[PDB]
């Protein structure tokens, strides 16, 4: 329930092939930019990185939990 | 005090449908 990992924006490259290795069965990948996830503090700065580096981008708006009204007294209401 | 051979020991991860041997 911690929210400290939902704070900074991250841009992540598209996932690619992960074929099984014949000798040991370890996962093997041919994509170099797979494990790379860069962290950017604000949406504007991350968009800038994609434009100057020439990678295509598809930004997703942050969705933050909506305020929810809670009060211990309210559920004690037999009425409802 | 008085040649190995390495191999994967895990199973098949994705089992594969087998076609029906009954012809149609």
């Amino acid at each position: 329930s911690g929210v400290n990992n939902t704070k900074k924006w991250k841009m992540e490259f598209d996932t690619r092939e992960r074929w099984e290795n014949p000798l040991m069965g370890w996962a093997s990948t041919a994509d170099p930019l797979s494990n790379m996830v860069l962290t950017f503090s604000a949406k504007e700065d991350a968009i800038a990185f994609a434009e100057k580096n020439g990678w295509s981008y598809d930004v997703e708006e942050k969705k933050v939990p909506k305020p929810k009204s809670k009060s211990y007294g309210a559920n004690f209401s037999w009425n409802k | 005090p008085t040649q190995y051979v390495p191999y994967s020991t895990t199973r098949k991860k994705i089992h594969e449908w087998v076609p029906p041997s009954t012809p149609y």
Binding site: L23, M24, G25, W26 | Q3, Y4, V5, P6, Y7, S8, T9, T10, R11
Partner: protein, 106 residues
Amino acid sequence: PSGEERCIACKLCEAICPAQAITIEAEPRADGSRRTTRYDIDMTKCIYCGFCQEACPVDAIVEGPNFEFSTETHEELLYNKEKLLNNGDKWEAEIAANIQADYLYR
């Protein structure tokens, strides 16, 4: 002693290995217990730090005394669970004596 392998696949030996050497995948054994289907230490990747010895809660993975395991082929150096378990059975008597001598220190 009973004969049940110590590892319970918590997989933090994999987490703290500096070189990414240990690969562990697990599934509940029919007994219902938790065991590793595959435990592969890539010794060529391993830099013999000894943290895995440190990290294990059940102390299933240990740094054994033998240093003479030079091999003709690269594949032999990659080790699966069966080689390590076999290595464990062969050197268990000395490993037990060594852990016996140094556990108070740790």
